[PDB]
Design a protein around this ligand. Structure first.
Ligand SMILES: [Zn+2]
Lengths: 217, 101, 129, 83, 101, 149, 65
RNA sequence: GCGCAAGACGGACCAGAGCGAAAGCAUUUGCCAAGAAUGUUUUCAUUAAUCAAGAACGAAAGUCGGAGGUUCGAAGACGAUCAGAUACCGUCGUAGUUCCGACCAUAAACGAUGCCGACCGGCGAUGCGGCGGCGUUAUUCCCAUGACCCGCCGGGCAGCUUCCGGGAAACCAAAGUCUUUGGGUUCCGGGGGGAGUAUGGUUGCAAAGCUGAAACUUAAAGGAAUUUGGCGAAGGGCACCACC
RNA sequence: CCCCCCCUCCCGGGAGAGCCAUAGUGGUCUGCGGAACCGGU
RNA sequence: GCAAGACUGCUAGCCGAGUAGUGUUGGGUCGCGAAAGGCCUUGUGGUACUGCCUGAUAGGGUGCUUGCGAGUGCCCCGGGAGGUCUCGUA
């Protein structure tokens, strides 16, 4: 993550971070996110350190690629902002998605049709989506979280400092996580990046789908 | 069985406050325990406001209001349906009902 | 006020071990505290413990390894005999394979097993297991 | 924090804490010296005076007693001394 | 002519303020009251009844009050709430004619 | 906590660890000793003497420039009074409170504070008797209000 | 329930991409706090980055009562 | 509507705000005295914590002596309510209610939770004092001053949340750090009635306050919470065996 | 004549203590050496 | 003494001049502030508007609007045209 030479951040990833707005936080400050906030700027906004973000992204990607079963990692999304990101991420890597109304009878109830126990769980946000945390507490299941400076941290193994209020930031973070896990698995070689499109994971509001449908052929 | 987080009033560091009097009753309930109301009422609410305005000599004359307040004992307030009881799971809701009109 | 600094120190390190902190703070210091922490580190329940020195009141920083369960203090200052410490260790210690009884003898602050093999005894400080 | 190291933190950590909660025990007030703009003799004064003090030569009063640090007379040059 | 002038004052909430309390200490109120009494007794003891009334038809005493008292704590609403007369001099006619012209 | 107040406080001096003479200060012991002599014959209590020295002359403390404190110097000369300063101030405060309560009859809390400061005077009197600085026949009463003012 | 056909506005929408990536903006709006953040990580200065004035007005934290 | 006179009280401003040991305390002004917290590189140096003897203060009501007693109002007087009210209701109404003295020391005087000291998490607020830092306001430039905002420090009433932990549970950041049982110390209780009773002592002019039994009966008396009750409890819906 | 008027749109002339600037324009800061040290008047 | 740089208030050609007058928070180098008279190259290019009002093109009060809320509109003088701006009406 930071012990080697090639694993450090590239030059355009900083540009993508500053374009997507992955540096500004909320208004308050939690007592577990104190080691990721460096200094409080004006307008009541706290700044996360981007080196810490890239480092924990590398650690989480290593933890994801550590298992040898690609269909045993599960991703969870609840709100309507990040929906296509986890779906196309599971299409690319091989994960299993649950987007929209995570049913509580999955990891505990062993007679239901929707009964699948995973090895790693990746949540979009603990505060907005806390039901898989409580059910992951009842079985041997670690969690991966994309947490903000105002999101409480509980039952979290690896925490990713994030700005999870904009869809572009979450989509670009998912894009870099997918890029890192496919480079670490051995599909895309490290010497050449596959950066063809980061807008595969970008979500837009229902105005822009009609606008782009009328603009395109 | 203890009922509430507090003792049911606004006494927390004093011991004794001045007593007040109810309006429809005459109970000597303390001030920090009773129920207050800052009601605003016009002289004419919606009955004959146009009849009052068209009978006014002065052009562009606005009717005044009546800024008076009343004090209620607890039995008097619950008999007049001012306060209402609720359940235990929502009993820790100090927030007032919303105002629209 | 404070009149038993050793009981407060042992209660503080017990509470901080039960929560799971690694480095703790003790506001007083004395001879009895530093010899008790050396016999702690010699029998192997803590790690490298530090001490700050000033001209007013020293403080002690203690490293933890989690190898302790509970560490209490006999108050008030009782006295025992050689035909008496077995009665204490039967009704106080959780077992005889572990758990130590410390006591102040003529040779200094020391635990009960080498007091048994050296055949001397005296006032009792505290206990830990 | 779990393994919070209380041996040597950043000096901002001892700055924000109290004067007695600091692990190395030292106060916050200091000594200072300040002169009169129309004089030669310069004298030293503590940061919290608690009595009114005038400069030597009985020319013009220098400090004023406040609840906190003593406020200085307007138009006076000073610098903090340390050792 | 002996009068008894009353005054009232309410403090001003700033537009930048977030705290909803906005009270003042007792010595602040004491010094404000001392300044208010001195300013109010200065403008009456120097002139007759007609001149201080002609100064009282607009808000000149009040304009002096929010001119001079905003340096200690900003206040916005001061009216002369009541002026009470106690004693009058010997009754005559030239004063009565000269107040009418 | 305090020994009559309900609350607990934390407000006192705090000397630093550095036990050394300040290098920037150039002062001997004889000049500051005769300054103690002059400010003691001017008629002031040793707490105010320490205050005025650390206010004007820039001294950290006398113990860091000598080997002894103020009252030991004053008893070495002999200009230290036979009554301690804190006990003198407490007796003066009790005399003032009793003088006020002579003319103000119905004042319960002032009488209670009089009882509290008499308890303080009694505790300091027993301490000063058992540490052999005052003779055992000494005893404080109301009629001694003009005796030890 | 899922629908077999509703005239192309289905899950095939999560396949296309705009030709402009909406990330290669020529001017980057960066506060000087973020400039001193990024001056010590991998870069020291960028030509495509414009240092803006710190927009410090009156305050923040609007009240709700 | 205008004057005179007496007594009582200080609304709205007044808040989960302040002060005091508690009972308690709100018109301005003038005088005396005391005190928490804050700050301190000032002074004495173990002066410390809790307390049987003994002591101070102590809401209302109660008794003894006065000027004077608006209004309200025990006991009482007169009518309606009621099968029956000497109760609820209305009109009068003595002692009292306010002040100066002289007394008993009783309340749900309850936070129904003793005092001191150490420790174990967070969040955002208010009050005091101190401190650092953008920008506005007291004729447009500086300074500290009052106020506005952003953070820090100490004490106090606190609020929200927390599988820290505790508890029979209500609930508690103490009611925690407890069978893994020991920090110091004062008062205080062993099923429920008899009974805070009789006697004796004690204080008191006066009511009573403190101390405080025995015989006999009794297998339950009690605390928490759940399930449909049952409410001259609240809020919804239905029925011509209900109505229009 | 819809008018005593009055109002709106289109087009010009005058003061200002807004920005990039000009002539008389007053101070602060940014480096270099006072041959080199120890005291008295 | 050298080397030049970043910032800085007033005046409209200059002296008069920061000058009378002007301010209550307190002083300071203290804001705003003409002149009369005299003397000289004989006196600034691009760039927005202006509800009376106390202190400016700022701060701080504070409107008219379809009756209800809002986008536009609102300094002195002159010329032409018109005489019911709009978005939904608890
Ligand atoms: Zn009532």
């Amino acid at each position: 993550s930071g012990a080697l030479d090639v694993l450090q951040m590239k030059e355009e990833d900083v540009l993508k971070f500053l374009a997507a707005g992955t540096h500004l936080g909320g208004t308050n400050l939690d007592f577990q996110m104190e080691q990721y906030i460096y200094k409080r700027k004006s307008d009541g906004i706290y700044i996360i350190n981007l080196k810490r973000t890239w480092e924990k992204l590398l650690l989480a990607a290593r933890a994801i690629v550590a298992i040898e079963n690609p269909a045993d990692v599960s991703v969870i999304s609840s709100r309507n902002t990040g929906q296509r990101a986890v779906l196309k991420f599971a299409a690319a890597t091989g994960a299993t998605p649950i987007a929209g109304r995570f049913t509580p009878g999955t990891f505990t109830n062993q007679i239901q049709t929707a009964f699948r126990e995973p090895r790693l769980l990746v949540v979009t946000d603990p505060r907005a989506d806390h039901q898989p945390l409580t059910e992951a507490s009842y079985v041997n299941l670690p969690t991966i979280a994309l947490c903000n400076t105002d999101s409480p941290l509980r039952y979290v193994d690896i925490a990713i400092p994030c700005n999870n209020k904009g869809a572009h930031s979450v989509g670009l973070m998912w894009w870099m996580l997918a890029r890192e896990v496919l480079r670490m698995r051995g599909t895309i070689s490290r010497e050449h990046p596959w950066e063809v499109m980061p807008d595969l994971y970008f979500y837009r509001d229902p105005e822009e789908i009609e606008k782009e449908e009328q603009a395109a052929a | 069985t203890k009922k509430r987080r507090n003792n049911g009033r606004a006494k927390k560091g004093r011991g004794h406050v001045q007593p007040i009097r109810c309006t429809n009753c005459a109970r000597c309930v303390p001030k920090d325990k009773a129920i207050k109301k800052f009601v605003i009422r016009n002289i004419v609410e919606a009955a004959a406001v146009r009849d009052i305005s068209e009978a006014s000599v002065f052009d562009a004359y606005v009717l005044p209001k009546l800024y008076v307040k009343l004090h209620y004992c607890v039995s008097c307030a619950i008999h007049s349906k001012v306060v209402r009881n609720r359940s235990r799971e929502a009993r820790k809701d100090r927030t007032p009902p919303p105002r629209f009109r | 006020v404070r009149m038993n600094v050793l009981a407060d120190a042992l209660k503080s390190i017990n509470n901080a071990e039960k929560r799971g902190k690694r480095q703790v703070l003790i506001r007083p210091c004395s001879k009895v505290i530093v010899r008790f922490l050396t016999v702690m580190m010699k029998h192997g329940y803590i790690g490298e413990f530090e001490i700050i020195d000033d001209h007013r009141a020293g403080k002690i920083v203690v490293n933890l390894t989690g190898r302790l369960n509970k560490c209490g203090v006999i108050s008030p200052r009782f006295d025992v005999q050689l035909k008496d410490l077995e009665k204490w260790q039967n009704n106080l210690l959780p077992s005889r394979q572990f758990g130590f009884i410390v006591l102040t003898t003529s040779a200094g602050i020391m635990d009960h097993e080498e007091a048994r093999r050296k055949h001397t005894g005296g006032k009792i400080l505290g206990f830990f297991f | 924090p779990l393994a919070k190291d209380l041996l040597h933190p950043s000096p901002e950590e001892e700055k924000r804490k109290h004067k007695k909660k600091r692990l190395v025990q030292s106060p916050n007030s200091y000594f200072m010296d300040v002169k009169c703009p129309g004089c030669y003799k310069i004298t030293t004064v503590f940061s919290h005076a608690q009595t009114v003090v005038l400069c030597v030569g009985c020319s013009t009063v220098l400090c004023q007693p406040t609840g906190g640090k003593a406020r200085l007379t307007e138009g006076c040059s000073f610098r903090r001394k340390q050792h | 002519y002996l009068l008894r002038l009353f005054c009232v004052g309410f403090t001003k909430k700033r537009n930048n303020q977030i705290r909803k309390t906005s009270y003042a200490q007792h010595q602040q109120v004491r010094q404000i009251r001392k300044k208010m009494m001195e300013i109010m007794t200065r403008e009456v003891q120097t002139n007759d009844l007609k001149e201080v009334v002609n100064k009282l038809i607009p808000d000149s005493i009040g304009k002096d009050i929010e001119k001079a008292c905003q340096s200690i704590y900003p206040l916005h609403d001061v009216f002369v709430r009541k002026v009470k007369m106690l004693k009058k001099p010997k009754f005559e006619l030239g004063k009565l004619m000269e107040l009418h012209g | 906590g305090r020994m009559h107040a309900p609350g607990k406080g934390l407000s006192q001096s705090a000397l630093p660890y550095r036990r050394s003479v300040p290098t920037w200060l150039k002062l001997t012991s004889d000049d500051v000793k005769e300054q103690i002599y002059k400010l003691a014959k001017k008629g002031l209590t040793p707490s105010q003497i320490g205050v005025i020295l650390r206010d004007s002359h820039g001294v950290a403390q006398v113990r860091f420039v000598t080997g002894n404190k103020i009252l030991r110097i004053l008893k070495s000369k002999g200009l230290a009074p036979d009554l301690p300063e804190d006990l003198y101030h407490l007796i003066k405060k009790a005399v003032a409170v009793r003088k006020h309560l002579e003319r103000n009859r119905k004042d319960k809390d002032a009488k209670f504070r009089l009882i509290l400061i008499e308890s303080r005077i009694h505790r300091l009197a027993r301490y000063y008797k058992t540490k052999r600085v005052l003779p055992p026949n000494w005893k404080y009463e109301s009629s001694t209000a003009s005796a030890l003012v | 329930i899922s629908i077999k056909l509703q005239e192309e506005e289905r899950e095939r929408r999560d396949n296309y991409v705009p030709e402009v990536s909406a990330l290669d903006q020529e001017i980057i709006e960066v506060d000087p706090d973020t400039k001193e953040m990024l001056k010590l990580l991998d870069f020291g200065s960028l030509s495509n980055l414009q240092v803006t004035q710190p927009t410090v007005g009156m305050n923040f934290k609007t009240p709700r009562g």
